[PDB]
Amino acid sequence: RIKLLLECTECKRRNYATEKNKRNTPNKLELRKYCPWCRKHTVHREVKI
Amino acid sequence: PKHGKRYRALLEKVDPNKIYTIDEAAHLVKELATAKFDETVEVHAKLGIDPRRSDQNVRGTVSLPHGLGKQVRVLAIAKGEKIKEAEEAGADYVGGEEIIQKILDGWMDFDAVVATPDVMGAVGSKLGRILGPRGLLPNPKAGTVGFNIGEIIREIKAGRIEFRNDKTGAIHAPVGKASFPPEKLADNIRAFIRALEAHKPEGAKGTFLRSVYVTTTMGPSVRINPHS
Amino acid sequence: MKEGIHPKLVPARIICGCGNVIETYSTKPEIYVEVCSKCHPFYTGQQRFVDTEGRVERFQRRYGDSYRKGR
RNA sequence: CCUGACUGCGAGGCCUGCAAGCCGAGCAGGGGCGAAAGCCGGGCCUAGUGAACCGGUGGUCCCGUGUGGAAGGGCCAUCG
RNA sequence: UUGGCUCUUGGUCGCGCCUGCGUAGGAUAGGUGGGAGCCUGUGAACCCCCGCCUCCGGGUGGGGGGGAGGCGCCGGUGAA
RNA sequence: GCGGGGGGAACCUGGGGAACUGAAACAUCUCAGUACCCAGAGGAGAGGAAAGAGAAAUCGACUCCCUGAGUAGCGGCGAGC
RNA sequence: GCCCGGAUAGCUCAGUCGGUAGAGCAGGGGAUUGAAAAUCCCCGUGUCCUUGGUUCGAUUCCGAGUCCGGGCACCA
């Protein structure tokens, strides 16, 4: 609705760690990186709504 | 009321009330027509699914060697000792890259395709307009792709047996002629619908075994019983 | 007890909380009623060796005149 | 060129009736960056936000009213 | 509590083979898939009544007039 | 020929059953199954031999006193119960 | 947030439930009409939701999304 939206980010399915980045103009691209708790760091990613 | 078929005469032996039982049903499919060669027993089946989703599709096969030397034509390409395996393990039709050329011009006398790992880029790229979505593409679960070419070939004329679904969901297999014992025929059926459990897509449910049946290839047919 | 049955005997009390639900799907129901209420039976009957009535109630009438026809 | 718009933590404090509010070196984790020191746990700062309660989803696998499951709840995240 | 009976229809899913026209296609072949053919009690597929149902033949089916054929394959046109 | 018939300070059981207030307003809730109305029995009443209790292959009619415990708990998870 | 239904031509809209994409309005072109209207005739705008998919292919059928459209459901 409001151009910013919450997104909770995902690693590669198995559990995750969250936090906004919006929505607005730049559409469906969504990737980043970010280090979880499954394993230790390793790549993580994004995904998810 | 009377049906304009002389097969009505033959229909006297063709009285498909009870689905029957497998030895005995095999006796019925023996007891269909008897003129040109042995009565042409040819298994088929189908089931309840949602074809337009691509997700439920499978089309496999596995070794059932038997004394049937004629089912599922398959071009069986190879390069060397593997050619020896093809030619001696007994396909009725085998060739190499040159036969792929004969196909590249326009030719078609085999039902499916299998080959050695070495050429698979070729058959898997050059023939895409040749094969289409017709299932001529060799498929690792279809007993095709890999070094496993040769042993499966001896099945085409002994006990090939393979599956196939699509946009109509019908499926097929070999089982044996008419003058075939019942200890081997029935076993080929039990194991084939053990194979039907072996290849049920998992999103559809219910009474998945809706039908199992046998059309003699140009002539009389018998829904065999998929149970006893 | 004149709105009881006779083969059995029946006249019960009530409260009637209305109000929402939506329990097992979301929040929790609204409720707001302390209203006491009546909740009750019925009448009708038949014949002796000529000359009767009965009163009775519903299920125990199928049962009822079964019985009493059985004399 | 990437993601440190990181998890685990926090000595010490500013403020302050309470709850809030805000700053934090330093250590482990595992990274980004330059060759290296050294930097980085959001934005140059001061507004852009809300206690609880009851629920929502995804985990954890903690409990699971005789024993075993499960319903159900808790704890983690996180939304109305 | 409250019955009968009659007429109805609408729906539901199979069943009865009761159907399949882009195009080309010895033709109006849903497809999947099967493999190179099956009957004569009408000994006929020649026509000879009628019918099924039609956006033509049609595909389909009872009548026989009975005199060993009829269609498919191969072919071949096809996206099969 | 039997019996009921009514009357009782308080107590009891059943059939009915309320608001002020309490929540610093207020309906869910509480005051409260109270007060009170009526029916009924008695010198006591009901209760009462387990289609129980609940965790021990244990207990063993019920009522009453203590403690359990203001815990387990139920709640605009607020009052409070 | 659930089920529905919706991105076909200038407009609003056909849509064999897979081989073709077009209808009233709308323009303009032209004719006669007293003149404007009205008459009547005629050439035009396209993946047919962006996309795949099953199939031989795709307005058509699967679907993911999409976004609008309506309705429902909303005890913090």
From Swiss-Prot, chain A:
Protein name in UniProt: Large ribosomal subunit protein bL33
InterPro entries with a match to the protein in the record: Ribosomal_bL33, Ribosomal_bL33_CS, Ribosomal_bL33_sf, Ribosomal_zn-bd
Keyword Thylakoid part of the UniProt annotation: no
Encoding gene per record: rpmG
Function field: Found on the solvent side of the large subunit. Contacts the E site tRNA.
GO MF term list: rRNA binding; structural constituent of ribosome; tRNA binding
GO CC annotations on file: cytoplasm; ribonucleoprotein complex; ribosome
Keywords recorded for this protein, A-Z: Ribonucleoprotein, Ribosomal protein, RNA-binding, rRNA-binding, tRNA-binding
Subunit structure comment from the entry: Part of the 50S ribosomal subunit.
GO biological process terms on file: translation
Family as reported in the entry's similarity comment: Belongs to the bacterial ribosomal protein bL33 family.
UniProtKB/Swiss-Prot annotation, chain B:
Keywords: Repressor, Ribonucleoprotein, Ribosomal protein, RNA-binding, rRNA-binding, Translation regulation, tRNA-binding
Family matches, as Pfam families: Ribosomal_L1
GO terms, molecular function: rRNA binding; structural constituent of ribosome; tRNA binding
Superkingdom of origin organism: Bacteria
SS bond list: none
Gene3D superfamilies per UniProt: 3.30.190.20, 3.40.50.790
Record-linked PANTHER family: 54S RIBOSOMAL PROTEIN L1, MITOCHONDRIAL, LARGE RIBOSOMAL SUBUNIT PROTEIN UL1M
Purpose: The L1 stalk is quite mobile in the ribosome, and is involved in E site tRNA release. Binds directly to 23S rRNA. Protein L1 is also a translational repressor protein, it controls the translation of the L11 operon by binding to its mRNA.
Quaternary structure and interacting proteins, as annotated: Part of the 50S ribosomal subunit.
Name the record gives this protein: Large ribosomal subunit protein uL1
Species of provenance: Thermus thermophilus
From Swiss-Prot, chain C:
Keywords in alphabetical order: Metal-binding, Ribonucleoprotein, Ribosomal protein, RNA-binding, rRNA-binding, Zinc
Cited Pfam families: Ribosomal_L31 (PF01197)
Residues binding Zn(2+), per UniProt: 16, 18, 36, 39
Cofactor binding, per record: Binds 1 zinc ion per subunit.
Presence of the UniProt keyword Ribosomal protein in the record: yes
GO biological process: translation
Record family assignment: Belongs to the bacterial ribosomal protein bL31 family. Type A subfamily.
Subunit composition and interactions: Part of the 50S ribosomal subunit.
NCBIfam families on file: L31, PRK00019.1, PRK00528.1
Its job: Binds the 23S rRNA.
Record's protein name: Large ribosomal subunit protein bL31
Gene: rpmE
